[PDB]
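Input set for joint prediction.
Command: fold jointly, output tokens.
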Amino acid sequence: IYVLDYLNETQQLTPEIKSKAIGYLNTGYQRQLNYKHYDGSYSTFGERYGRNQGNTWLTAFVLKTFAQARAYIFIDEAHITQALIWLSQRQKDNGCFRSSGSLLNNAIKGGVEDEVTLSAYITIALLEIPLTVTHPVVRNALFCLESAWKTAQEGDHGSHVYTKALLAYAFALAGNQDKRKEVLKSLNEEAVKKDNSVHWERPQKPKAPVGHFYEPQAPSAEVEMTSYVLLAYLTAQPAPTSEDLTSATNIVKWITKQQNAQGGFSSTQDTVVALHALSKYGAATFTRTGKAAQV
Amino acid sequence: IYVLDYLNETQQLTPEIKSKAIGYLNTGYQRQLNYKHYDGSYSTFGERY
Amino acid sequence: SGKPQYMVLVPSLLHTETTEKGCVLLSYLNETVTVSASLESVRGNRSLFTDLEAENDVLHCVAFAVPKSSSNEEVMFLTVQVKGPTQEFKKRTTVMVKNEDSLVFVQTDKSIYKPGQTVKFRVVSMDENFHPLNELIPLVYIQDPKGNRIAQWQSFQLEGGLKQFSFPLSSEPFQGSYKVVVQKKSGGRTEHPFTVEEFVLPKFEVQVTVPKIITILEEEMNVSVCGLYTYGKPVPGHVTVSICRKYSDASDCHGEDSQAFCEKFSGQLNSHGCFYQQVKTKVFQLKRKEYEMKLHTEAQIQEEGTVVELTGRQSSEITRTITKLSFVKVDSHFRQGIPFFGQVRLVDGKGVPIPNKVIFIRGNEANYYSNATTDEHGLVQFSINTTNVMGTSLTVRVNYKDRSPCYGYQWVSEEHEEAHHTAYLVFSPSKSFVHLEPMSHELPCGHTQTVQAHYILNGGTLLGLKKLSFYYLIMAKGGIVRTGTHGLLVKQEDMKGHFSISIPVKSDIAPVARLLIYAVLPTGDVIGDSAKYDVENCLANKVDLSFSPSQSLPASHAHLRVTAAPQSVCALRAVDQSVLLMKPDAELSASSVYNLLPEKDLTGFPGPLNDQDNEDCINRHNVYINGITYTPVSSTNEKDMYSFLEDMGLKAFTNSKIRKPKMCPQLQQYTVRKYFPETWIWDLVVVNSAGVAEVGVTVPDTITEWKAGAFCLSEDAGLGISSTASLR
Amino acid sequence: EDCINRHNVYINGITYTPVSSTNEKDMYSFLEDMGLKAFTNSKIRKPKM
Ligand SMILES: *[C@@H]1O[C@H](CO)[C@@H](O[C@@H]2O[C@H](CO)[C@@H](O[C@@H]3O[C@H](CO)[C@@H](O)[C@H](O)[C@@H]3O)[C@H](O)[C@H]2NC(C)=O)[C@H](O)[C@H]1NC(C)=O
Ligand SMILES: *[C@@H]1O[C@H](CO)[C@@H](O[C@@H]2O[C@H](CO)[C@@H](O[C@@H]3O[C@H](CO)[C@@H](O)[C@H](O)[C@@H]3O)[C@H](O)[C@H]2NC(C)=O)[C@H](O)[C@H]1NC(C)=O
Ligand SMILES: *[C@@H]1O[C@H](CO)[C@@H](O)[C@H](O)[C@H]1NC(C)=O
Ligand SMILES: *[C@@H]1O[C@H](CO)[C@@H](O)[C@H](O)[C@H]1NC(C)=O
Ligand SMILES: *[C@@H]1O[C@H](CO)[C@@H](O)[C@H](O)[C@H]1NC(C)=O
Ligand SMILES: *[C@@H]1O[C@H](CO)[C@@H](O)[C@H](O)[C@H]1NC(C)=O
Ligand SMILES: *[C@@H]1O[C@H](CO)[C@@H](O)[C@H](O)[C@H]1NC(C)=O
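tokens >
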């Protein structure tokens, strides 16, 4: 879906590959339907038996993906609605969503599985759908986000990067321009700026005994978080400003330079959100009509 | 499909059942795709061998 | 003193375009409370807000209204917010709203029509409460059978809660079953059939008598035939009764007669009285392979040669299960600290009690093997002191765990029912509880009633206060209806048990009457239980019909009287009961209006909404057992307060421990001029403040029954259904 | 012969739970690994159900 978006936004698209991708989308969509739950949740296997319970993160991923798919191909609103009520059911009055761990591998998930990060990813997936901030779920979620950002800001460490980035994106979608600029400033303070671009890594190297190789329990999630920061900077109510676009250009340069020759990026999460951010950047900057620039 | 056609031609149709049938059509379509042949033909089982 | 307490109760299935009540309970320090419920439609944006001031230990019930929705059936997010000067609480869930359809029905002036006649029918509409509702109906039509619809009326609006229509059928109408169909705005449809054919008016009806239920151990059978006539007088003639057993050894296809053994008895229906006959069921072979009993009686009335047939006792149940005992007051739950007493009835076959007969009550998981005996009423009240494990199984038998005669021969049809029942104990973290001794039964109406309650308080209030309280709700019609409270100066530190409750049964209560009661303890603890009273099918608006009496000879002066509300309307259908003598009407009674209702009783949350899970996972590294060995983990299976309110049909938001502390699963994974007959009166009449009285015209040469059906309606009291005064 | 297995484990408290075999050292095992054997009435072995 995000590949289709990148191609359409860049105008580098043909109807042949479009039809091919359409067929792939329909097939994968139904195959995913083959793993949902009776209530509307999702899991690794699920269907063909009921001796399991769904996962939350996976359901959110399905929700976001189905939303964009709805943007291009036809889909049933009943499924997104069911997933939405399910997530709301798995939410707490004060606390945030619970991580109903039923996954197979953490590589697919580009996060640290922290309840705050999970809740943030959820609410951003919700806000990606056109949903009013006065809505209940997003209200409680915003309370969680505000509290988590407050504790992570006053404290010397709140993971220092991933959280703050996703929080910034969420705040940007809500409308709290002030909170957006504040957390964004906090992020910019801990910059990993290079010769002609800028970016952010994990806490420069993980402190505790870590490593050995293969990204064990830590997929590096650098492309995804950087793209999240990008998408945040690119969001505003009237239209974005200029400064945010400059920083966006920097990180975009880093992103395109980080691409993989085999295709995509290091994983699925990063490729998805990265292409999403690039698509929005194209929708903002690139214009198929504007063709008479004089400098 | 022909049921949808009968309803649309007779005007006795609502968007709810329309969406329901659309989902059924897509599902049955893919399930049928699960039985075609490599050349494009069709059989009872076919695929997976 | 203790923790502050709040509690909001609301049904799960909400109806629109009307009012529905929800209750709230508040108490304990920092009482300047403000509660607010917000029902919001998630997808898109919809919001219905409601507020209410809240004080100490008050159970106030507010009636919020809901208007129509865009879609038909849809879920919604209900969020309750409690704000105290120094406290706050918020809890939400998924409430299912439904654009319910009204309960509409049809009534015809006749059941069977002949060519050239005018079909007259009435359309009635109503809501859950039976207060008449005015409405613009999109469609009502009469249809011929080929789908060649015979008549059609569009967009008419009901005003007095009903509307009457008429359609003159022709001289050469299509014959068969026709049908009246009404279509409501919601897309809903309702069908009321009626037939059109030729027929002669019968001046008599056969009425036979045979056991409604014939069983295995039967050597003979009583049979009788009596024929009612004009004014129910006796009729002389001949009778041919064909008592029969149906579905024999024959194949039953193209050459074999399905008809099994038949016995034909000829009787001479005398001048006075009726005919009797004692038959022997030896020829029927009332055993394993042969089927049911159809009795086709055919009476031939003299001087006309008119034969009429009646199909009786087809379902005489040759039941392999004999001595089928019973139960009556078998409690579904128990407690590990109480003597529960279950009342059990024992009957056999047809339904007659068996007196002075030894029986055995076996209680497994409690080791209660005892003997008892069937008294004059075949009732036995057995009590068991419960201090045992989770589930108790109770059975009762008069024979033993096997069919005494030839059980497994593959060619026998004898059996004996075994009373079986299972009961679960309630959960009680405080070790205190309530249990009602109900009059679980056919509750009357228009009367008071007392239900007794047993409270076993293990220490009762730990610190709390002196006054403790109980709050009860008698809910109905998938909603609520009545509420109330009660409290008591608790004993200092013991488990005091007896206290009764009183409630009126005037009306406004479905056949089902779900009563629940819960007592709150200031320590953040609560207890409670349920009960079932199958209310008698009676209506709110009392109604009755009378008449200036039966008198022969067409003297027009005759009267009909009706008693109902002081300002109402009444649909009167006085029918010359000749066609009605032939074929009956179509389910016109209180029970009909009741079963037409949508979801008579609400039990269990509806389908779409699943639940409201929690997060309190108590899974230890290992179950932590010191002693003989360590133990693994496993889920429990016992009733709970949350389950009480779930089976009740509603939902609630609280803070106290309601649900059982269920643990999260394992994370680890891999002089006369004939008038029109077959009818008499069909009209509407106004009811003044003293009962209406119409003067009907006694008609000539129409000697049959005269069923007078009264269907009244009043905006204040509701509808009314009163009997068939047969001014013969 | 000591079999303390109840019908249901009789696990009072918040919930019930099944039985299982333990895994811990015992005096009987101390004397077993010691090499010798002894006759005594006291509670030496664990009450294995
Ligand atoms: C790819 O996605 C775009 C959505 O961005 C699909 O629509 C094209 O979208 C642009 C806006 O993004 C439309 O532009 C409009 O032009 C009018 C003047 O004609 C202007 O007033 C509007 O403000 C807006 O700029 C454009 O009309 C629209 N359709 C086109 C180009 O045919 C696009 O269809 C997608 N590509 C596909 C389906 O191949
Ligand atoms: C149902 O099937 C029809 C095809 O039969 C789909 O297209 C509809 O076709 C009708 C003609 O059969 C269109 O009516 C047209 O009206 C114009 C004047 O406005 C007239 O000049 C044309 O000759 C023709 O009569 C109609 O516009 C068109 N769309 C409709 C009916 O909405 C229709 O889309 C199908 N509907 C479904 C599948 O929901
Ligand atoms: C809410 O729904 C109504 C329904 O007509 C719509 O008019 C309105 O724009 C929506 N938003 C708000 C904030 O009311
Ligand atoms: C309100 O309730 C709290 C909770 O226990 C209690 O401690 C306090 O005394 C009450 N009054 C206040 C906070 O003014
Ligand atoms: C049947 O009729 C006989 C007399 O004919 C009578 O004594 C008996 O009580 C009746 N009822 C039965 C046998 O159930
Ligand atoms: C059951 O016990 C009672 C004594 O309590 C005894 O009289 C009776 O005979 C016993 N049952 C039978 C079938 O004898
Ligand atoms: C019921 O019998 C049990 C036997 O364990 C006894 O403990 C209990 O006291 C008896 N019931 C009453 C009310 O005493």
